[PDB]
Amino acid sequence: EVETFAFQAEIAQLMSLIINTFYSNKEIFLRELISNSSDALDKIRYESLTDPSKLDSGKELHINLIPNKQDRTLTIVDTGIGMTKADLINNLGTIAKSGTKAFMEALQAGADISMIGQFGVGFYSAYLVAEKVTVITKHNDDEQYAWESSAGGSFTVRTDTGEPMGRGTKVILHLKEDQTEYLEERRIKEIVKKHSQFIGYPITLFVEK
Numbered sequence: 001e002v003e004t005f006a007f008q009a010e011i012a013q014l015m016s017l018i019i020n021t022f023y024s025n026k027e028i029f030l031r032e033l034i035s036n037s038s039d040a041l042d043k044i045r046y047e048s049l050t051d052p053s054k055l056d057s058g059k060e061l062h063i064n065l066i067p068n069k070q071d072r073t074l075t076i077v078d079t080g081i082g083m084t085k086a087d088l089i090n091n092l093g094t095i096a097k098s099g100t101k102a103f104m105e106a107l108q109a110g111a112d113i114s115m116i117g118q119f120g121v122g123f124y125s126a127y128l129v130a131e132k133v134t135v136i137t138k139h140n141d142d143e144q145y146a147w148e149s150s151a152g153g154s155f156t157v158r159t160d161t162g163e164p165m166g167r168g169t170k171v172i173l174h175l176k177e178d179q180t181e182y183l184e185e186r187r188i189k190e191i192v193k194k195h196s197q198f199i200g201y202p203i204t205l206f207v208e209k
């Protein structure tokens, strides 16, 4: 059972700008998603200091980067706090509305796309490199869900029946045909070293076979 939702007009406008604007510095998408994963890990860590049982769904706090050339996907997995259904459908978009307005004001004031993460909408930089984004997520207080959007003004949410995750978020980037460099080990290593060198969680770059 798949539910289809419309993005808010302002968010759809931001995704169109990300997809259609000429901007060669696409590699910043990885910095932004790793930063989001680090924030999600900080949140479950801090919550567990006063309720240890919040880690019953998984004690390890980490980030995995998993490329797959056969599927042409780059997957960013974290074991952070995850997202509720209300997060996916309402709450993140409510924050993103004011951040988007602030970001697009900065952009016409001379700022550039790389600054997007300061406005809370860094997740959408995924569409610099991905034609479709699938997000699998599990919060301690909700079920496992799959969020998915190919932009174009709508996204879907369904209950996810696949491999149970325990807790956290998996972002699956279905890469555009001309962005397969982000499946190469040396390229991902370069980007992590350049932009994410001091993240306080183990980042494991998986190799393919």
Ligand SMILES: N#Cc1cccc(-n2cccn2)c1
Pocket (backbone or CB within 6 Å): 088, 092, 093, 096, 120, 121, 123, 124, 135, 147, 169, 171
């Ligand atoms: N991972 C992730 C994810 C999934 C759905 C929506 C969002 N999101 C909306 C505004 C800011 N982030 C992030």
